[PDB]
Design an enzyme around this catalytic site. Structure first.
Site, PDB file in Angstrom:
ATOM      1  N   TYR A  72      31.096  32.218  91.257  1.00  0.00           N
ATOM      2  CA  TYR A  72      32.143  32.990  91.468  1.00  0.00           C
ATOM      3  C   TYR A  72      31.844  34.650  91.814  1.00  0.00           C
ATOM      4  O   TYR A  72      31.095  34.756  91.106  1.00  0.00           O
ATOM      5  CB  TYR A  72      32.906  33.122  90.107  1.00  0.00           C
ATOM      6  CG  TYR A  72      34.392  33.947  90.017  1.00  0.00           C
ATOM      7  CD1 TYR A  72      34.285  34.910  89.520  1.00  0.00           C
ATOM      8  CD2 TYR A  72      35.331  33.215  90.681  1.00  0.00           C
ATOM      9  CE1 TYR A  72      35.688  35.586  89.560  1.00  0.00           C
ATOM     10  CE2 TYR A  72      36.627  33.811  90.456  1.00  0.00           C
ATOM     11  CZ  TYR A  72      36.847  35.139  90.038  1.00  0.00           C
ATOM     12  OH  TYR A  72      37.955  35.442  89.872  1.00  0.00           O
ATOM     13  N   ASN A  80      42.368  43.191  78.574  1.00  0.00           N
ATOM     14  CA  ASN A  80      41.839  42.021  78.601  1.00  0.00           C
ATOM     15  C   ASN A  80      41.210  41.451  77.482  1.00  0.00           C
ATOM     16  O   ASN A  80      40.356  41.992  76.860  1.00  0.00           O
ATOM     17  CB  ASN A  80      40.357  42.499  79.525  1.00  0.00           C
ATOM     18  CG  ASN A  80      39.311  41.350  80.046  1.00  0.00           C
ATOM     19  OD1 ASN A  80      39.590  40.126  79.959  1.00  0.00           O
ATOM     20  ND2 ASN A  80      38.377  41.887  80.942  1.00  0.00           N
ATOM     21  N   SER A  82      41.557  39.329  89.183  1.00  0.00           N
ATOM     22  CA  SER A  82      41.165  38.163  89.898  1.00  0.00           C
ATOM     23  C   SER A  82      42.471  37.390  90.415  1.00  0.00           C
ATOM     24  O   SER A  82      42.307  36.454  91.272  1.00  0.00           O
ATOM     25  CB  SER A  82      40.169  37.411  89.364  1.00  0.00           C
ATOM     26  OG  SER A  82      39.007  38.247  89.253  1.00  0.00           O
ATOM     27  N   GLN A  90      29.907  41.190  92.164  1.00  0.00           N
ATOM     28  CA  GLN A  90      30.245  42.388  92.460  1.00  0.00           C
ATOM     29  C   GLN A  90      29.762  42.972  93.536  1.00  0.00           C
ATOM     30  O   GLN A  90      28.487  42.833  93.991  1.00  0.00           O
ATOM     31  CB  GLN A  90      30.040  43.408  91.253  1.00  0.00           C
ATOM     32  CG  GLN A  90      31.012  43.083  89.877  1.00  0.00           C
ATOM     33  CD  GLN A  90      31.061  44.213  88.775  1.00  0.00           C
ATOM     34  OE1 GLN A  90      31.648  44.097  87.695  1.00  0.00           O
ATOM     35  NE2 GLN A  90      30.183  45.003  89.061  1.00  0.00           N
ATOM     36  N   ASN A 146      33.328  38.270  93.773  1.00  0.00           N
ATOM     37  CA  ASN A 146      34.355  39.074  94.507  1.00  0.00           C
ATOM     38  C   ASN A 146      33.713  39.303  95.982  1.00  0.00           C
ATOM     39  O   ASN A 146      34.253  39.522  96.644  1.00  0.00           O
ATOM     40  CB  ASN A 146      34.763  40.275  93.929  1.00  0.00           C
ATOM     41  CG  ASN A 146      34.936  40.246  92.598  1.00  0.00           C
ATOM     42  OD1 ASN A 146      36.062  39.374  92.265  1.00  0.00           O
ATOM     43  ND2 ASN A 146      34.617  41.047  91.636  1.00  0.00           N
ATOM     44  N   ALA A 185      41.216  39.444  85.566  1.00  0.00           N
ATOM     45  CA  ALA A 185      41.146  40.609  84.549  1.00  0.00           C
ATOM     46  C   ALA A 185      40.681  41.893  85.461  1.00  0.00           C
ATOM     47  O   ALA A 185      40.072  41.573  86.427  1.00  0.00           O
ATOM     48  CB  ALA A 185      40.213  40.200  83.387  1.00  0.00           C
TER      49      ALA A 185
END
EC number: 3.5.2.6
Length: 354
Positions: A147, A336, A61, A117, A149, A311
């Protein structure tokens, strides 16, 4: 490096590596425009290759910061505007829930609940379209931050459309090259594979899997040297010669929304400096939060703790800088490990240097 810097770094990182059982790690401290590098362990346990200043780590990220800056640069060039509706760049997004969702919402995770995701079944360009057409927002745009992606990743893909360039070509040409980040890649070329560290999850060597919008959301790989240079560019953008890139960096550090003590930039996240360590440290895994709009967005504030956590399945990274103190840090590891541990280490180090 000055013994002071040497000591605080080693006394903080050495116990971290041991507690988290991190195979390899690189750290750069940028102090008053000068970088000091440190490295430990292995990039590849099996072949006994040590971590060096040329080792490539998956940023995860932390890549979103490059995306926010590239988008910021597209804005400065007059190619897009954050106030533009998403449909202006993807007119095929005709489902009505998209009315009112602007590129600003995509970039700052405030479109209304876009998922963390992109689903794994999303492959083709048409599969992506279907995913977004069928997505049902939980909230009106501009009300909560989640948050995702699937959110900034989409921002990145639309941002580069007027340019005519693909996301990777735009990134290399408008960001990597001008900033002389010559060992930073979205796709690692065969020639640089010898330096590509393996990530480690449950003891197994792993690299990030290909995925929809991966380049835009979490697919950059880089060295501790280029990352330190990235940090210096963000610490002092006014010293960058490319006019639009300089503005782009500044735009990525603007405060668009506030939640608790945190402000959302484009990629970068910020808090007022001095910051309470338990505010950024405990501030750990991604929940739904109400956001207050900052109208208009506050321009980059020098007295801020600017940072981004990142991560992949087998890597853990963290970047943080305080413009006002010309101070910054980069921590890249091929494991991670808990976010709170990264932030706590970064705070002990930077707080010690001022």
């Amino acid at each position: 490096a000055p013994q002071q810097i040497n000591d605080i770094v080693h006394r903080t990182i050495t116990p971290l590596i041991e507690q988290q059982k991190i195979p390899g790690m690189a750290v750069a401290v940028i102090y008053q425009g000068k970088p000091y590098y440190f490295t430990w362990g292995y990039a590849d346990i099996a072949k006994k290759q040590p971590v060096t200043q040329q080792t490539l780590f998956e940023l995860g990220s932390v890549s979103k910061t490059f995306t926010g800056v590239l988008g910021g640069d597209a804005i400065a060039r007059g190619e897009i505007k954050l106030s533009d509706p998403t449909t202006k760049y993807w007119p095929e997004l005709t489902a009505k829930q998209w009315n009112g969702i602007t590129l600003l919402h995509l970039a700052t995770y405030t479109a209304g609940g876009l998922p963390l995701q992109v689903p794994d079944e999303v492959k083709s360009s048409s599969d992506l379209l279907r995913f977004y057409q069928n997505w049902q927002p939980a909230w009106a745009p501009g009300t909560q931050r989640l948050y995702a992606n699937s959110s900034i990743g989409l921002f990145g893909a639309l941002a580069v459309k007027p340019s005519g360039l693909s996301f990777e070509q735009a990134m290399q040409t408008r960001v990597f090259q001008p900033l002389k980040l010559n060992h930073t890649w979205i796709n690692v070329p065969p020639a640089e594979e010898k330096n590509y560290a393996w990530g480690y999850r449950e003891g197994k060597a792993v690299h990030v899997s290909p995925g929809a919008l991966d380049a835009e959301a979490y697919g950059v790989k880089s060295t501790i040297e280029d990352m330190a240079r990235w940090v210096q560019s963000n610490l002092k953008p006014l010293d960058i010669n490319e006019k639009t890139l300089q503005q782009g960096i500044q735009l990525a550090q603007s405060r668009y929304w506030q939640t608790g003590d945190m402000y959302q930039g484009l990629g970068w996240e910020m808090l007022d400096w001095p910051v309470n360590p338990d505010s950024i440290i405990n501030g750990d895994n991604l929940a739904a939060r109400p956001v207050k709009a900052i109208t208009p967005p506050t321009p980059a504030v020098r007295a801020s703790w600017v940072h981004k956590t990142g991560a992949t399945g087998g890597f853990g990274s963290y970047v943080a800088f305080i413009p006002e103190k010309e101070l910054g840090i980069v921590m890249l590891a091929n494991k991670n490990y808990p976010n709170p541990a990264r932030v706590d280490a970064a705070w002990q180090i930077l707080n010690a240097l001022q």
